[PDB]
Amino acid sequence: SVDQKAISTIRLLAVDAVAAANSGHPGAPLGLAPAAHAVFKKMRFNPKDTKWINRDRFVLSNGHACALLYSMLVLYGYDLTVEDLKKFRQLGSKTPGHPENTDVPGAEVTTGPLGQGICNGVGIALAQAQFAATYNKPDFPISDSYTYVFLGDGCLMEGVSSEASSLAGHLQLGNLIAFWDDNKISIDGSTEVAFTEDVIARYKSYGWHIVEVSDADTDITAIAAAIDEAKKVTNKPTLVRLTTTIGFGSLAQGTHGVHGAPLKADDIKQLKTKWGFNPEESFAVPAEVTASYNEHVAENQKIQQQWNELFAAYKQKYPELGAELQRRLDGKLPENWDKALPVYTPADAAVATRKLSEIVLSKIIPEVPEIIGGSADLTPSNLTKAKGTVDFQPAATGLGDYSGRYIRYGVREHAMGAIMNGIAAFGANYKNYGGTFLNFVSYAAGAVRLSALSEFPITWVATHDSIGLGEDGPTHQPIETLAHFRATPNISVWRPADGNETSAAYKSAIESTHTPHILALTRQNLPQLEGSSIEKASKGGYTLVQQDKADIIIVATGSEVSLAVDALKVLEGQGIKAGVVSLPDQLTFDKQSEEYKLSVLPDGVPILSVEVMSTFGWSKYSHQQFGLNRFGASGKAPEIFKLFEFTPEGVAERAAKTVAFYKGKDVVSPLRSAF
Amino acid sequence: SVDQKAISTIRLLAVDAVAAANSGHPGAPLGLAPAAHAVFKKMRFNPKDTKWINRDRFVLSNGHACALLYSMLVLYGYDLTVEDLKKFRQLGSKTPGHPENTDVPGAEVTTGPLGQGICNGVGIALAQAQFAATYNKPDFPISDSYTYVFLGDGCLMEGVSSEASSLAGHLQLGNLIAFWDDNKISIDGSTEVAFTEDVIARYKSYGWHIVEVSDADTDITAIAAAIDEAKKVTNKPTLVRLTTTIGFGSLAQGTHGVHGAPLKADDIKQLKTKWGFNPEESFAVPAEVTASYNEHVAENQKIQQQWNELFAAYKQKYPELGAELQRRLDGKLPENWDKALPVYTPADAAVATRKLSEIVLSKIIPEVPEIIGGSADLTPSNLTKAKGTVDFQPAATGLGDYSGRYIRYGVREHAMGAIMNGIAAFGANYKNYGGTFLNFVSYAAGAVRLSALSEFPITWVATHDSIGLGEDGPTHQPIETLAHFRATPNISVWRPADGNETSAAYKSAIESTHTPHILALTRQNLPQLEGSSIEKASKGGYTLVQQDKADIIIVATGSEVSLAVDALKVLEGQGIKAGVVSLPDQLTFDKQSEEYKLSVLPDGVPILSVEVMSTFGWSKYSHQQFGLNRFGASGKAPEIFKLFEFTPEGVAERAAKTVAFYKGKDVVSPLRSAF
């Protein structure tokens, strides 16, 4: 039949791509081609409009199987061709060895690191439910799309998927339909060696619906029926167990050897003949398969055409909501939204930056509907919920509504990170955030790195940033955390010192379209600074205190800026004139012009950095560094700062030593380099 | 009764400690005091010998509840007193706000970061099973101890605990007995808001045994009976559901407000009177409670006395095993074990450092019985299994034996990290390791940081360290990873360049007693270097190529050392004389004498670093840095190195620019500083 020919075409495109690269993963593509065929035939999508907001989404969580995804995209006429498949895993191609949303048309997210994609799917589905609750009206199903996820044994072993699956079950996300490739094989061999749990019983315990397909190597009728069944269960996410043979059809089917290396050439020949293909030919695309797939595309395009007319009618019936929706689909924030950001003067009271963050959110959430967010069981500590909003919960619970704006993630940092990526991936201008203690953002590093690689504008509200948190002690106090994320490409790590800097940090985070943000916020109160403004802090680094005859410049962040200003006064009494630079975001600063940056960190003067955590990175901006390169302590925070000499006198002593160390030396800006 | 008085004493010590600090967590201590009393009465331990190898272990995974643990330790006469309880959460005390094994007698591990302790308990139990299988003989139950873990809702939400619980069920770890504090309250309020899964059904799906105690606020008989029941189930770990009221007895019991802040003074008064204590008194310890607890200690000490005689008899009956066991309990490796480390010369073939690691393990595993380890589903890629060893599995599976030495962790990096911490915590000189790709060590950051804080000599075998892995692409290629871990206190991050350096890295990792190791290893082959040796590489950094008239020194690690040596030859043709320094471990180097370090990185010469990942940290050792501060690419590895100019000519160009940049300047070692 044409369906059988399409499945063979998919299988053989994937095998031939792996063969051409002499690299990659043929096993899961062979096993999942029937399911991929069946799912894509049920999906609504436009290969010529990858951003249609009511498309069904597909996520390949087992991203090593991407030769399968690329084959589907090619067959459906996305902006990906057989010539790109021939360049699988080759430098600069559109077919990298794991799918990247920035590079691959039709890849919703970046997968490959196991467990991430299913959590991203939870976030896409969460966003769709929130979006539909916000915009749909009687006779106007603006959003009614599904989220389809493929995942394997490896994703099911990774704890992040347990976190997200528990939460998705709690949230009753009935438009999520996941498919487990139940092939009993991973890299170390049989799953009997390490993965003998009853997966289905576990997913029932989360509140998921289950459909089992015992012959998923052939039974596309049953796979399609499983999708229909899942769509009728509107209050539970569904897991479809696809019992497959890894490498189905290969001489080596059902073995770990077919997981992750090219097939032998003789194996590929027998595959082709068993399925009616020419064993002398590679990258075959039978025209009848193209015709069949084209008919589905044409039907989907007529569905999108009708959706566009529905949207036009919605704009007439619901003028305000329609304009809001249009603005969001255009990727634009409300005009002048930033006028809602709080502004402070030096006469205002000292405030912790976690509380300043609460105040910002309180002002901007009512003005910017595409902001949603939550906390990992730290709502009253991170201060991430605006008073008067409702939680995102299924209404059946009585605890919230899908129109709600605040997510109770539970103690699930890693899944929160990957769910945020999925919310961003949904689109519609979502600007979403997640709170935890800064030290526990590290639990989510797998997802945070993917925010950066995927270019998603997510935001971590990362409070309790340092030894300033006090008594909880060294298990809670960041040392390495800023250095880790600042060393990751494409992460904006804001450590605001005061009210105006906190507003600048949020301006950056909400305006972002391609860069994730981490806002490192204090438990403890900090004064409003003389010289701060949103305007200057928006530059990432700026001269807070200018001193034309400076003997030294002190560059600092966050809680240490006020410390530097107090040290300047001690130094004055020692006959030393200091300037102060505040560096709330190193990435934003780095992006400024060379001339601007040199105006902040000029030649001809020693520069000392001060920040109560690792000194890594700081030599970009300073000649000497005063930091904290050991673990913290459990005690009242001011006593810890005193112990480690983060006091005005301790900073002054090190500044004076810095001045003395450079006497008789020629000093050029840390910004200079040889290449 | 005395038991009732003991429970009240525990509760009130914990409340009074929180009150004195005006900080900390009274709720879970109040709820778990009955269970703590019951469990400690079943445990075998010696407060005067915290290292008795056959003690039962206790782990408080919900580490915020540590006022409970400290109260138990005080009441049982560990080296912790009421005066220490009065200093709870005060700078420098023995009672920090979360328990630290380095500081608190009777704290087996460092907990507080949720989810870790239960996984540590899995590792303690895994080690006990391996240890017992190795040493026990008929009539000689050298090891027969249990592992008791308390955990709360937060630990159950964290994915790492799912990973470890799935694995522990697979491993049939019948001496593990965990207790869930089922109090339905977390920081964000009721668990109904985020955590509605059927926990018991999930644990059954992992293959755990379940006991439910529905009245754990009072029913110590049922808690004791649950322990007895768990001990009869020898092939399953057990979860005991303790249904408790958080803050039991408080006016605020059953609320989130009692989780994490001191009680009101009037509340503490009514607690004391309801339980027969003087509301005017704090830190009361009734002498009848001390007497009751002392009788249990005296009985336990007689048990240990008999164990010591059993061990003496074992040494006569099993002379070789007895001597091996004695050596391990003395904390000593076999005499001259390091003579088994492979040594190479420059005439030997090029080898990937992952393969060199395999060869080391092959030589040292047969010589050092206390080495065990595994991989997170990457055994044939990390090359972490020695041929001829058997896997650690329950014999009932047919797949291994508890005497085995190789652990199939599955795709569970985070739990592997925390399990390794538990294996190290067991003691008996275990030197244990875990393999994954370097980029996915990041999934385990929560546990890795705790290895450093806890001072455990665990080892990550972290292969596929860079863009050198090639086609899997940027989702797999480390950039920030070394910088992250090098910025963490107390992590030895070895990046060996060749065979001799790989042997030095293992010498360090296996000899370690207080410092975790990460070995960053290559996919790709590297040449044996002229000038390398175990002796010199053991210094962490050393002069590979000495050049008395150097115009520049190039400092490099790993795969980039050979690149530096090739660049030296290009530079010679440009009239520039270079030296080369290899820096296989920055931490070990930093610990050398100032004079040694200056002999490697002298004054008076520009120094350029080369390492194909982040430049963070490198200014400690260099004036200019050539690194990779952007994500990687999917292609054949040599093409990626060429794209980014990590070639002999690209290094030479940057070296020549460095020489030119310092012409006319006075240059001092990067090791110098102002303070």
Ligand SMILES: CC1=C(CCOP(=O)(O)OP(=O)(O)O)SCN1Cc1cnc(C)nc1N
């Ligand atoms: C173990 C591992 C794999 C086996 C998957 O096993 P699986 O899901 O059952 O896949 P399969 O049915 O055999 O094709 S892929 C490559 N990888 C390394 C790998 C490890 N950890 C993380 C976080 N991401 C990864 N990418």
Ligand SMILES: CC1=C(CCOP(=O)(O)OP(=O)(O)O)SCN1Cc1cnc(C)nc1N
């Ligand atoms: C959320 C959070 C807590 C609630 C526990 O909730 P729980 O286990 O149910 O404890 P309980 O019964 O209420 O006393 S503790 C402090 N913490 C922050 C916290 C967050 N993430 C990590 C990895 N470790 C932490 N330490």
Ligand SMILES: [Ca+2]
């Ligand atoms: Ca599999």
Ligand SMILES: [Ca+2]
């Ligand atoms: Ca709880």
